[PDB]
DNA sequence: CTATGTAAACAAC
DNA sequence: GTTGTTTACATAG
């Protein structure tokens, strides 16, 4: 990573799409195909944990929310939320076990 | 303390 | 296995 974060990158892939929504697979594709850094799924396929990491960021903060299709199958798109308003602390971890 | 990055133990598939 | 969460620890600043 030259300058940016996983958090940001994801929010970025999801930013420039024909229509706003992406999917892990699709997100994963962005990563592997853009910015020399990731190489995993490209022509060949899969290196370790970044796979697991991206899932973390997405599910964790406040810019990403998930949307499925009510129907029989798997349309889970990752979109962005709350832009007009800003404020809202995110329980920044450690109370405890 | 805070944000980032990881590694991994898991509820549903 | 895949997707989604959520503990937990590691730093760097």
Quickly give A93 CA vs C10 C1' distance in Å: 15
Q: What b/e readout covers A45-73, taking b as 16+ CB neighbours within 10 angstroms? A: eeeeebeeebeebbeeeebbeeeeeeeee
Task: Give the Cα separation of A11 and A3 in Å (integer).
Answer: 15
State whether the beta carbon of A58 lies below 7 angstroms from any atom of strand C. Answer: yes
Q: A22: how many CB neighbours lie within 10 A of its CB?
A: 20
On whether the CB atoms of residues A85 and A96 are closer than 8 A, the answer is no
- Residue closest to A66 by CA, chosen among A54, A57, A79: A79
Cβ–Cβ < 8 Å for A31, A9: yes
Please report which helix (H) or strand (E) contains residue A58, including its range: helix A50-60
* Amino acid A74 CA to nucleotide B13 C1' distance, rounded Å: 11
Contact flag, residue A17 CB and nucleic strand C, below 7 A: no
Resolution of the deposited coordinates, in angstroms? 2.7
**Start-to-end C-alpha separation, chain A:** 33
Topology at the third CATH level for domain A1-91: Arc Repressor Mutant, subunit A (1.10.10)
A3-CA/C4-C1' distance, Å: 27
Q: What is the C-alpha separation between A47 and A59, in angstroms, rounded?
A: 21
Domain map (residue ranges) of chain A: 1-91
| Strand B nucleotides within 7 Å of a protein CB | 2-9
Find all residues with CB under 8 Å of A8, minimum gap 6, and list them.
none
- Report the 10 Å Cβ neighbour count for A9: 21
């Amino acid at each position: 990573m030259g300058n940016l974060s996983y958090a940001d990158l994801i929010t970025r892939a999801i930013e420039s799409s024909p229509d706003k929504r992406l999917t892990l697979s699709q997100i994963y594709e962005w990563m592997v195909r853009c910015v020399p850094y990731f190489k995993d799924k490209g022509d060949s396929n899969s290196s370790a944990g970044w796979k697991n990491s991206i899932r973390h960021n997405l599910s964790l903060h406040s810019r990403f929310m998930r949307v499925q299709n009510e129907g029989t199958g798997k349309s889970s798109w990752w979109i962005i939320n709350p832009d007009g308003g800003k404020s809202g602390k995110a329980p920044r971890r450690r109370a405890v076990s």
